[PDB]
Amino acid sequence: NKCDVVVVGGGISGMAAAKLLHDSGLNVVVLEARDRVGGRTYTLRNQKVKYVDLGGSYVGPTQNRILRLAKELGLETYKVNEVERLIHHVKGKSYPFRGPFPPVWNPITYLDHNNFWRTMDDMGREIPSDAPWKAPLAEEWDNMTMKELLDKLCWTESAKQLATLFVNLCVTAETHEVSALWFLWYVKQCGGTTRIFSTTNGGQERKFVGGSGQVSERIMDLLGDRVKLERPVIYIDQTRENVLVETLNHEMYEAKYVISAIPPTLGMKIHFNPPLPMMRNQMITRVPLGSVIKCIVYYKEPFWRKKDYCGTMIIDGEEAPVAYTLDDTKPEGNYAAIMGFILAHKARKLARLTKEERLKKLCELYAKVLGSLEALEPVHYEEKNWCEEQYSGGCYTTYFPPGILTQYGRVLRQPVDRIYFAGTETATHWSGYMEGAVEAGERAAREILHAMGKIPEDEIWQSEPESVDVPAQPITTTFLERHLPSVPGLLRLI
Amino acid sequence: NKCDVVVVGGGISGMAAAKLLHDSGLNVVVLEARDRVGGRTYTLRNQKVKYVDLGGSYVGPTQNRILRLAKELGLETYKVNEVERLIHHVKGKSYPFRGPFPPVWNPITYLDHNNFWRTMDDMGREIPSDAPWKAPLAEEWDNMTMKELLDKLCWTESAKQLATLFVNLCVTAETHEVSALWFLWYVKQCGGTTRIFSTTNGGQERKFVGGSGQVSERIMDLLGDRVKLERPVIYIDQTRENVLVETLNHEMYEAKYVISAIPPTLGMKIHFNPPLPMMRNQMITRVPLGSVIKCIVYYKEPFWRKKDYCGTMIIDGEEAPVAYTLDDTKPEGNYAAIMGFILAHKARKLARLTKEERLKKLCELYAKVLGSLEALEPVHYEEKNWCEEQYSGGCYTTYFPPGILTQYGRVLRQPVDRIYFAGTETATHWSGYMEGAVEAGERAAREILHAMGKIPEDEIWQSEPESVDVPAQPITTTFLERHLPSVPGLLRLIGLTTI
Ligand SMILES: *[C]C1=C([C])[C]=C2C(=[C]1)N([C][C]([O])[C]([O])[C]([O])[C]OP([O])(=O)OP([O])(=O)O[C][C]1O[C](N3[C]=NC4=C3N=[C]N=C4[N])[C]([O])[C]1[O])C1=NC(=O)[N]C(=O)C1=N2/[C]=[C]/[C][N][C]1[C][C]C2=C1[C]=[C][C]=[C]2
Numbered sequence: 004n005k006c007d008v009v010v011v012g013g014g015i016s017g018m019a020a021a022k023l024l025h026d027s028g029l030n031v032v033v034l035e036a037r038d039r040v041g042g043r044t045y046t047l048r049n050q051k052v053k054y055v056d057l058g059g060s061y062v063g064p065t066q067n068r069i070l071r072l073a074k075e076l077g078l079e080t081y082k083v084n085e086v087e088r089l090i091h092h093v094k095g096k097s098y099p100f101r102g103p104f105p106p107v108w109n110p111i112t113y114l115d116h117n118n119f120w121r122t123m124d125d126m127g128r129e130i131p132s133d134a135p136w137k138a139p140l141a142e143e144w145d146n147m148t149m150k151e152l153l154d155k156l157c158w159t160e161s162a163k164q165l166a167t168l169f170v171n172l173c174v175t176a177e178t179h180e181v182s183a184l185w186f187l188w189y190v191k192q193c194g195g196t197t198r199i200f201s202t203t204n205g206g207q208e209r210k211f212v213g214g215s216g217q218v219s220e221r222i223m224d225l226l227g228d229r230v231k232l233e234r235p236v237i238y239i240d241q242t243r244e245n246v247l248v249e250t251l252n253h254e255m256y257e258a259k260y261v262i263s264a265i266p267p268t269l270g271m272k273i274h275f276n277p278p279l280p281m282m283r284n285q286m287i288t289r290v291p292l293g294s295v296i297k298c299i300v301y302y303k304e305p306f307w308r309k310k311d312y313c314g315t316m317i318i319d320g321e322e323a324p325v326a327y328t329l330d331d332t333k334p335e336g337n338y339a340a341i342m343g344f345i346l347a348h349k350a351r352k353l354a355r356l357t358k359e360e361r362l363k364k365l366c367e368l369y370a371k372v373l374g375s376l377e378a379l380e381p382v383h384y385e386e387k388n389w390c391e392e393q394y395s396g397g398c399y400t401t402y403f404p405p406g407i408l409t410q411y412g413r414v415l416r417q418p419v420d421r422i423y424f425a426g427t428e429t430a431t432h433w434s435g436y437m438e439g440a441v442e443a444g445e446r447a448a449r450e451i452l453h454a455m456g457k458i459p460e461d462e463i464w465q466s467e468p469e470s471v472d473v474p475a476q477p478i479t480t481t482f483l484e485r486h487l488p489s490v491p492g493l494l495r496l497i
Numbered sequence: 498n499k500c501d502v503v504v505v506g507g508g509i510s511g512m513a514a515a516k517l518l519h520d521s522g523l524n525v526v527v528l529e530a531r532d533r534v535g536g537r538t539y540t541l542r543n544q545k546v547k548y549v550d551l552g553g554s555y556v557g558p559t560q561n562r563i564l565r566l567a568k569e570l571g572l573e574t575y576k577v578n579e580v581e582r583l584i585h586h587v588k589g590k591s592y593p594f595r596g597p598f599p600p601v602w603n604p605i606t607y608l609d610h611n612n613f614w615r616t617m618d619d620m621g622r623e624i625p626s627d628a629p630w631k632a633p634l635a636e637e638w639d640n641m642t643m644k645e646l647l648d649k650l651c652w653t654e655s656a657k658q659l660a661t662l663f664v665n666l667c668v669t670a671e672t673h674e675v676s677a678l679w680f681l682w683y684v685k686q687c688g689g690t691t692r693i694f695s696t697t698n699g700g701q702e703r704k705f706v707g708g709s710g711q712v713s714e715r716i717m718d719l720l721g722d723r724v725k726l727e728r729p730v731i732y733i734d735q736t737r738e739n740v741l742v743e744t745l746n747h748e749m750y751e752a753k754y755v756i757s758a759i760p761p762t763l764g765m766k767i768h769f770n771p772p773l774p775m776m777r778n779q780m781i782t783r784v785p786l787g788s789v790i791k792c793i794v795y796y797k798e799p800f801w802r803k804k805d806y807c808g809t810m811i812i813d814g815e816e817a818p819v820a821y822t823l824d825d826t827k828p829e830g831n832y833a834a835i836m837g838f839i840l841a842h843k844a845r846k847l848a849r850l851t852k853e854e855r856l857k858k859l860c861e862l863y864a865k866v867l868g869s870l871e872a873l874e875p876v877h878y879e880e881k882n883w884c885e886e887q888y889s890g891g892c893y894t895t896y897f898p899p900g901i902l903t904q905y906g907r908v909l910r911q912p913v914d915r916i917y918f919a920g921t922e923t924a925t926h927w928s929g930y931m932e933g934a935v936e937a938g939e940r941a942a943r944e945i946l947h948a949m950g951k952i953p954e955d956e957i958w959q960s961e962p963e964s965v966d967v968p969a970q971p972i973t974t975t976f977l978e979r980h981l982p983s984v985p986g987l988l989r990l991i992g993l994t995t996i
């Protein structure tokens with residue numbers, strides 16, 4: 004019934020907000036639609052896998068908030084296997100390599116690839132993390148899809164194929180689906196192309212021992228009966244002194260303030276009184292989430308390591324169901340496994356098949372790419388298609404089609420009377436990630452603390468000390484990387 | 498409580514569906530979120546205006562279903578004023594003209610304008626009305642915005658400016674917001690560029706005497722207490738023998754079948770058990786409605802007619818708040834008025850102003866365009882910003898961003914167990930319009946009649962006899978219009994003669 008703050012959503016962001024408020028001495032209630040917490044994180048446990056992350060999993064350097072929260076809850080990380088060689092598979096052939104990006108030998112192709120990554124970062128330096136609509140060329144870049152930008156930038160099919168895979172992998176959407184401004188912002192606010200794409204020293208460096216679902220689970224443990232499961236929120240009424248929040252099972256909650264910690268578009272599932280302001284009313288119809296199936300194939304041994312392959316595969320082309328894999332073996336070296344993502348249109352196309360049919364296609368692909376018959380003998384399989392989830396809408400996160408970010412972007416975290424907005428989509432650093440979920444939940448919690456006169460305005464946004472366990476190495480470039488001409492640049496010189 | 502069919506939504510589509518089912522002898526209930534029926538149609542009545550349509554208003558030749566339904570309800574149409582000259586206002590100057598499209602004198606610009614409209618229709622002929630995703634180049638066209646297509650097609654700024662206005666006016670969205678495949682489908686399924694853009698012999702030919710809101714109102718009168726107002730649906734449960742539908746005010750309805758007659762994205766406001774299939778789950782998050790403010794400025798007399806202007810203005814340029822107007826004077830010649838649309842980004846930009854501020858900007862624009870000081874002396878003003886509507890989401894209709902129609906289009910009207918889908922967005926002829934609302938509502942109703950074994954399969958889709966009151970003249974082209982080269986076409990001819 005009555006409390007200080009109702010938090011709508013028991014994902015990492017909602018849980019992080021509720022914990023901060025609880026620790027500050029306020030009475031909080033979390034209303035969660037599902038019969039579990041964690042949202043876009045979900046750790047499955049069974050005897051065959053021990054544990055496996057079927058949603059969000061990876062953490063890395065510069066993601067200090069999620070690392071701090073997890074450590075406080077008694078969790079530890081381990082390093083994703085990147086000891087041996089990575090593989091770039093292109094035109095039916097595997098090319099092993101070391102370093103974050105697959106190397107290029109043809110001189111013209113080299114210039115084109117170098118210019119592509121460089122230009123993504125160059126453009127990003129003009130985009131404010133907390134206000135991408137304030138970029139000098141915001142409208143020009145927002146009125147273009149990533150497909151148009153890539154068609155302009157990439158003088159080789161080689162670069163365009165890799166750039167396309169990069170987009171698909173980052174935001175689980177097609178290049179023609181997404182705004183160029185939004186995508187460039189997205190990469191920039193994760194620290195740039197090297198940081199986002201790297202395993203060692205990047206976003207995919209580590210996973211949590213025992214799974215990421217433990218973050219939301221352990222906060223639920225701390226909050227006790229304050230978390231209400233199977234309470235989908237249906238109605239928010241702000242016409243009176245206290246805010247009224249109603250659930251599908253007909254419970255009524257009364258609070259001074261509300262935190263909305265759900266994907267922006269899932270705000271549509273709530274009927275508002277009074278109606279939302281015009282801009283938010285339309286915004287929440289314009290912001291879909293991507294499409295992905297996360298698939299984990301289990302083997303008797305991590306056989307790829309014997310061939311000096313780490314398990315990372317970057318796989319070009321339409322025919323391949325999975326464009327990117329990582330070794331998912333446990334740190335102890337057992338429960339050998341390969342994790343792959345079926346991305347964007349392929350998630351939609353391949354969903355028509357059976358689980359067994361998808362397993363077969365993945366095994367035959369992996370056998371090809373790894374050059375190993377052992378890939379054809381899986382011992383177990385787990386998968387999750389996030390497109391089917393009513394209370395997620397997709398994964399990993401919300402994307403912005405052309406024209407939307409400039410017109411509606413500023414309303415994302417703008418309070419509506421006594422409703423404040425959390426959720427990873429509202430973060431300014433690693434938005435889209437578990438890190439962004441923590442940032443946004445704590446920031447939204449502090450907005451309410453300020454509204455209550457409990458903290459000053461300059462404490463709403465708070466810096467985070469660097470993790471001592473996962474220190475960040477700086478991102479470096481070489482002289483030649485910085486100064487070598489693009490393809491059209493070289494032609495000008497000629 | 499218990500009935501044969503629950504219809505969710507009391508707009509024209511839901512009301513047409515409910516009426517058909519009722520007439521067939523079934524027990525129907527209509528659950529409507531608002532304190533009124535009509536949805537994206539709304540006729541305001543007061544002493545200053547008598548009546549005025551603030552939402553959907555125009556009907557025309559080839560829209561035979563809405564015309565038949567309205568006639569059966571005792572309604573009549575009248576012709577929108579197009580006796581005098583139209584105005585094209587470009588680069589701060591007005592150019593009066595006659596005919597549906599502004600004439601072009603520059604031979605190069607002429608070729609470019611002629612090729613633009615022609616090519617829109619050429620491309621449209623490759624797109625099946627009932628399955629646009631089956632077009633031979635569906636993926637190529639769907640992966641492009643209308644902005645990209647226009648940049649490719651238009652060799653003059655003049656053509657590109659007019660083409661941009663055309664898109665904004667048709668679908669209340671920016672050219673960079675919308676799929677080229679979807680937009681080309683949208684125009685084709687209204688009968689093409691001439692039919693959609695025309696007043697005389699097109700979509701803007703007529704309005705209903707007394708307002709379009711009367712269609713939904715008079716059906717409510719026929720259905721009596723079967724229409725439940727202020728019953729927003731929150732929950733649909735199909736796990737049991739009969740379908741359970743719950744409302745926000747905690748009422749429960751039980752039915753054999755359900756018709757969803759709401760904008761596709763507004764399906765998000767309903768919690769489903771079991772969850773929707775994956776494709777529909779995601780589709781309903783990918784399909785926004787456009788942005789528009791409909792504004793009506795009232796004057797003592799229709800003074801523009803005295804200067805041989807009909808009241809139609811096509812107004813190019815960023816500075817102009819309104820890009821298109823029509824005479825909204827009553828057929829009796831009184832309550833003189835100009836209707837204008839504030840479109841797409843301008844609906845968002847200008848919403849920041851007060852009502853009085855918007856009135857002032859419109860009057861000063863109209864004074865300039867009509868060359869008339871009388872435009873600065875309004876007697877009344879009415880407006881409606883559809884962007885603010887929780888139970889509409891926007892107007893006129895739903896648009897598809899790049900990539901969506903080919904991936905998700907086929908699920909739009911695919912039944913989900915015992916839920917069938919009406920609403921104008923699911924129509925195949927004048928989708929987006931009141932006509933499409935009628936087509937989709939009656940089609941969805943007949944899908945259920947077939948499911949009940951009451952009619953054969955071949956009766957689900959039904960042709961409509963042409964109106965005797967609003968006959969359709971065919972769309973014609975001239976020999977030169979058909980065969981004159983494009984700009985690049987002419988350049989090829991110059992290339993070959995020089996080679
Ligand atoms: C799904 C997914 C996947 C598959 C994967 C991934 C992911 C995901 N990611 C993302 C994450 O997870 C996120 O971000 C988070 O989680 C979010 O959080 P938040 O914000 O909190 O949200 P959520 O979860 O959703 O929650 C919400 C809640 O609420 C609820 N609801 C709803 N509605 C409602 C409710 N309640 C009441 N009422 C109502 N009405 C729900 O239910 C929930 O619970 C991620 N992240 C990270 O960090 N990491 C990771 O890993 C991840 N993942 C992914 C990744 C990938 N990566 C890749 C590889 C290579 C590369 C890449 C990228 C880039 C570059 C390279």
Ligand SMILES: *[C]C1=C([C])[C]=C2C(=[C]1)N([C][C]([O])[C]([O])[C]([O])[C]OP([O])(=O)OP([O])(=O)O[C][C]1O[C](N3[C]=NC4=C3N=[C]N=C4[N])[C]([O])[C]1[O])C1=NC(=O)[N]C(=O)C1=N2/[C]=[C]/[C][N][C]1[C][C]C2=C1[C]=[C][C]=[C]2
Nearest residue numbers: 506508510530536537553554555730892920921929930931
């Ligand atoms: C808004 C608007 C405006 C401003 C204008 C216009 C329009 C609109 N349009 C469109 C129409 O209106 C439509 O289509 C119709 O109406 C639709 O119907 P339906 O489908 O039925 O839908 P609605 O209405 O929306 O209804 C629904 C219902 O439901 C309900 N709900 C929700 N949710 C819910 C519910 N319930 C229960 N529960 C729940 N959850 C709601 O409330 C409702 O009621 C149009 N159309 C026609 O036909 N006409 C006209 O006029 C119109 N408009 C416009 C036009 C324009 N035009 C222009 C001029 C020149 C040109 C153009 C275009 C093109 C070219 C040229």
